[PDB]
Amino acid sequence: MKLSLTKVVNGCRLGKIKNLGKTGDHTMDIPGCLLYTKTGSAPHLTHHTLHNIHGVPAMAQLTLSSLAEHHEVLTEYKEGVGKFIGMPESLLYCSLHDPVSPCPAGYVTNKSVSVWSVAGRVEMTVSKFMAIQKALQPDWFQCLSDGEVSCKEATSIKRVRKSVDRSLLFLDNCLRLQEESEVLQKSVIIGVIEGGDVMEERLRSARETAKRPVGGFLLDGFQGNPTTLEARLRLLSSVTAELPEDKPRLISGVSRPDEVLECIERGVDLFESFFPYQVTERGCALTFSFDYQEITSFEINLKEKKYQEDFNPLVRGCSCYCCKNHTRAYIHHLLVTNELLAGVLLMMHNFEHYFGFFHYIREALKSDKLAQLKELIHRQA
Template identity: 35%
Template sequence: MKFTVSSVAKSTARLGSLSEFTRIPDAVLETPLLLLHTRGASVPHLSYDLLQMVSTESHILQMPLVTLVEHTKNVKTFGKGIAEFAGLKEYLNYVPVQDSGTTTPEGYHEKNSISLWTRGGRKLIDPQTYITCIEALKPDMFQAIVDGDTTSNSSMKRVKRSVDDTVKFAGICANLKEKSEVLKDTPMLACITGGYNIKERLRCITELKALNVAGYVLEGFHTNGESATNLIWEDLEPVLSETLESLPDNRPRTFHGPVTPIVLLKLVSIGIDIFDATFPWLVAERAGALVFPNSLLKGNAPITETLPSVKFPIQIKLGEKDGSLENENSKDELVDRVFEINLKDKLYFNDTRPLVEGCSCYCCRKYSRSYVHHLSATSELQGPILLMMHNLHHYINFFRSIRLAIRQDQLQDLHSTLEQFVTSRRS
């Protein structure tokens, strides 16, 4: 894999591209890049045909090992890798360790392994077992095994342990990768951990410099799921800024998790290159439709005065009847719905407008808010399908607008547009 930085904006936001993948050498993907999130090697709620209706462009699918580890024996027996096994061979794929859209339980640490929380329960996985799984999956890119179990509240002992284990695991993975006939040409991303401690993050970078890796993943800021949505930029910014200054410019930087669009823009502005599509999926899971302005074009801006006001934060008990999330995320999360509308709200019972005026997605062209409200209120299977199609389309266009804004030096304008939208909904 080759990563090229084509330009750097005044804000240090970067335009670049990923190319020269072994399996699909003609593929060129522009950065900032959106990874399409999958669970069990399938984009949630979308079949292959529906995914093609959302976008026919080239994408990289994010396939978390935690959702595949119980199936690696079958994939190995199949012999052609997860891409062909899942019927998605025209898409590149990337295998991280954890599912960044689902909260990872804290604790449960072992000396030489990490915990994967699968549908069948907790599974311990060490670097050797991990590389064996990766060999079976034959991904186009993968993440080194990592201990990213830190938050802003973690003790210094836990932070140091996360760095020690991450460096140790990365070294073992790199050594096993070089010896593997299957993986020796597959790019591996190393992980930078250390919680919110700048000194420990710099130590992690220093100790990883000896490894030949294709890029870096900024881990250890959250425990995935809604905890990423609740990240506070003022806490993140000083740690990330110093961390990124110490990383080589010719390697892509990845930040996993369903961060809000505003935080995502700020991450782009300081030089992060790769993100995932867990945010639009989580919104669809709680019967939400993304309505935030995803472009600087006036015709694409939603009419904010027609949208209900949203207070911050909103506490939703997961599993209640009000359209809250019903997945593996922890209960009592704070869910901010300022970027979306809740289609379970009776406000949309007779609303014949599309989810977003001017949106060209299949859902907005064919169906009304009233119809999607009916599907969501009655828990029809088509509800999350249509919402996922809309949300993913909306987010893909958002990233297209981000790249255009960097190219035209208008990233701050896009950020200001989002801030104004949020302010209007808070009033």
């Protein structure tokens, strides 16, 4: 993998990652996002419906929470998860947790972190974690890590320290296990920057992780309620400073368009696309402008009666399947009558709109019109 920067406007890194995914090359753009999935399918969408979307990201995020239960099955399939889930054309990043639900936390111990599934708590030792990675064969995978800091609010400085030390211990063990296996060689490991709200431990985490031969870094624990971020936003830029620039920066739990822009300012490259999913799930549609649990400002609520007779598309000019082929009035009916097509059509548009947003970020960055974009984004509905 090689990251090349087209430009660096303000603190914002515009570029491409060229030799990605083992098989030849797959050019992936920064800054960018990752197709959010549940059990390896995009939520609500089959291949048909997925490929009906313009600007689907090259890489797709999947999570151990859903896949680990079926370690056995995947071990028997012997051909890796991409082919199993019928996404063979896609690059795959395996995260430890689903960002929409990071509530359970692993009950991390020195010898075990645990994801949460339908079955229940799945206790993964390092060996088991690396075993699962063998079965899955993703392009990228987050290394087993201790991210519980954010979950609790106590943040005992001794706890914060353990989060860093544990994460580094896991990283070093996993690196060795990768050395031994040929298959695993082909996978790229992602280091997890940690340290919570303690500046010192954040910098310590950043440097020590960077010392390892990881392919990229995950910025954990900045995931927070909307108000909290501005605070941790300073800590963010402190940390990215300590990371080498020739390696990509992932962040977890940040998908809100506003927060996204800001993290790009602080030199973050890759984002989860779970925000469009959450919007979909509450019967809402992304309407905010980019072209140049509370319902947010970026969206309208199609459950509302104002839309029962509104025969405009969701967003005028949106080339997605739904806006082009259907009206708000129609979606309103679908939601009201509790039909599964509501979700499919909402997911399709919400994804396409979000994917369009990123396209205009990169475009803005080329013309240093990003500040104007910030303002256009904060336009209401």
